[PDB]
Each structure stands twice: as structure tokens, then as C-alpha cells.
Amino acid sequence: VNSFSGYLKLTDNVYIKNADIVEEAKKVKPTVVVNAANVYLKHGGGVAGALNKATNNAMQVESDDYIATNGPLKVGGSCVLSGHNLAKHCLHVVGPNVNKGEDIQLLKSAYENFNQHEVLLAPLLSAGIFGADPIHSLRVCVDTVRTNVYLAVFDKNLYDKLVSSFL
Ligand SMILES: CC(F)(F)c1cncc(C(=O)N[C@@H](Cc2cncc(Br)c2)C(=O)O)c1
């Protein structure tokens, strides 16, 4: 039993809710919140900018130190950093950005990072400003993630479309 509430169950292990991931993180304090990161951990907009703003820029400060030490992530890769006031940990995961021409096949590799964590609160990778089709992202999520994932979808119209078209 966990503290996630109001989710619709899509599969044995994938759940979905129309919610603001920032507000959901603030209420649940999950062990892991996933950030829709880029390879530079520059949290300017989309989910990343919203999460970072909610940490009063502490996420960005920590991220800049991480990059200065380790260099950029790989597209499809991830790193675990602090969750600050939102979660115990933040798993920064880099999905491919279609608006940069990155290969969409890397979306499966990106979701594989979720399997290293038993339970996660997450957005749909490569959705929103990353330019992928969220319906495709949900399909890859369901077919790749085996751990328990609670997906927060900010846009109500998109949420209803994701549920209604789900196979
Ligand atoms: C063009 C379109 F029709 F596909 C479209 C339009 N608007 C929003 C999205 C979207 O992917 N939203 C997700 C992911 C998300 C993105 N950025 C910020 C947050 Br916070 C959450 C959501 O709401 O959870 C997609």
C-alpha cells in the first residue's frame, strides 16, 4: 500500500492521473520524482522548469555542480540527485527531444532507467516541449517499465485522450 490517490490503473504496474507533478510531489513526498531533463540539466521550462522553480532554484544549483564534475548526460540516460522539498530523490531522465532531431528509439532506453526504482512519480518522457507524441510515450512506458509508476499528466484534455485511446 502506498499514498498515491485518485489514479486510474492502466496495467499491473502503471497508473495515471490528471495532476500537476509539482503539486503531487509536494503532497505525496514520493521516494522518487522523475524530471524530464536535458543532457545539460538546464531546467528552463516544461516539467523541469516547474520542478526547479518549486525548489527555489536549489535543483539547478545542485545540477550545475553535477555537470561541472561529471559532464553532460547521454540522451536516454539519467542521474539520481536530491529531491529537495519535493521527494527524497529526483531521477533526472533524458528522453529524446524531437525538436532537436534526436532518435525516438532512445525513448525506450530512457524509460529503462525507471526499472532501477521500485516506485516512481513521473511525467510522460519526451512529451510536452520535447515534441514526441504522448500516446506513443505512454505505450513505450507500459511496454518498458516493470516497476510501479504513477504518471502525472498536467493537461486534462490530454489525460482524457490518453485514457480513452489506451489499448
Ligand atoms: C502538443 C500536445 F498536444 F501534445 C501537448 C500540449 N500540452 C501539453 C502536452 C504534454 O505533454 N503535457 C504533459 C507533460 C508536461 C509538459 N510540460 C510541463 C508539464 Br508540468 C507537464 C502533462 O501535462 O503532464 C502536450
From Swiss-Prot:
Phenotype for residue 31 to A: In strain: Mu/B.1.621
Outcome recorded upon mutating residue 164 to L = In strain: Gamma/P.1
Where in or outside the cell it occurs: the entry states:
Host endoplasmic reticulum membrane
Membrane protein topology class: Multi-pass membrane protein
Notes on how activity is controlled: Inhibited in vitro by GRL-0617.
* Highest taxon of the lineage: Viruses
What this protein catalyses is: Thiol-dependent hydrolysis of ester, thioester, amide, peptide and isopeptide bonds formed by the C-terminal Gly of ubiquitin (a 76-residue protein attached to proteins as an intracellular targeting signal)
The residue ranges of the Macro domain are 1-167
Function noted in UniProt: Responsible for the cleavages located at the N-terminus of the replicase polyprotein. Participates together with nsp4 in the assembly of virally-induced cytoplasmic double-membrane vesicles necessary for viral replication. Antagonizes innate immune induction of type I interferon by blocking the phosphorylation, dimerization and subsequent nuclear translocation of host IRF3. Also prevents host NF-kappa-B signaling. In addition, PL-PRO possesses a deubiquitinating/deISGylating activity and processes both 'Lys-48'- and 'Lys-63'-linked polyubiquitin chains from cellular substrates.
Q: What does the subunit section of this Swiss-Prot or TrEMBL entry state?
A: May form homohexamers. Interacts with N protein.
Under what name is this protein listed?
Papain-like protease nsp3
Species assigned in the record: Severe acute respiratory syndrome coronavirus 2
